[PDB]
């Protein structure tokens, strides 16, 4: 299914399962990030609003764009 159809739960699974040394699922659940929101989520938001480091933020944004 298109990311635009993803629920908050689909996004949570996507994030928690993203291979890496940390887990950002709680961060996403707290912000009610569904598929539509995930498509709109950019580095500036992850970093300046959610307090994520730029490296991880860029990689998430990049993964989303690759999937789409």
């Amino acid at each position: 299914p298109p990311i635009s159809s993803w629920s908050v739960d689909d996004v949570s699974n996507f994030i928690r399962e993203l291979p890496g040394c940390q887990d950002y699922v709680d961060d996403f659940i707290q912000q009610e990030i569904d598929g539509q929101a995930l498509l709109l989520l950019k580095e500036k938001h992850l970093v300046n609003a959610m307090g994520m480091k730029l490296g991880p933020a860029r990689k998430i944004v990049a993964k989303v764009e690759s999937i789409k």
């Binding site: 908050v8 707290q30 912000q31 009610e32 990030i33 569904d34 539509q36 929101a37 709109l40 989520l41 938001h45 609003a49 959610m50």
Partner: protein, 70 residues
């Protein structure tokens, strides 16, 4: 037929809800904050999160809709 800047609170809510049904749960918040046309165009994510208590997801979706009519 009336355009954005002259929208009433209900017209703003109808715009948001008719374009993104997942945001309808926040309708009463828009009523509470008296978000009419002029107020809608004046919104931003920081104000929505800090003053309306909206989470980032909903705020970003609303900003996306605001941008279309601004």
């Amino acid at each position: 037929r009336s355009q954005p800047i002259d929208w009433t609170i209900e017209e703003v809510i109808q715009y948001i809800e008719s374009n993104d049904n997942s945001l309808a749960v926040h309708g009463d918040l828009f009523r509470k904050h008296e978000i009419d046309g002029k107020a809608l165009l004046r919104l931003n994510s920081e104000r929505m999160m800090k003053y309306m208590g909206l989470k980032l997801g909903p705020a970003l979706k609303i900003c996306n809709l605001v941008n279309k009519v601004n």
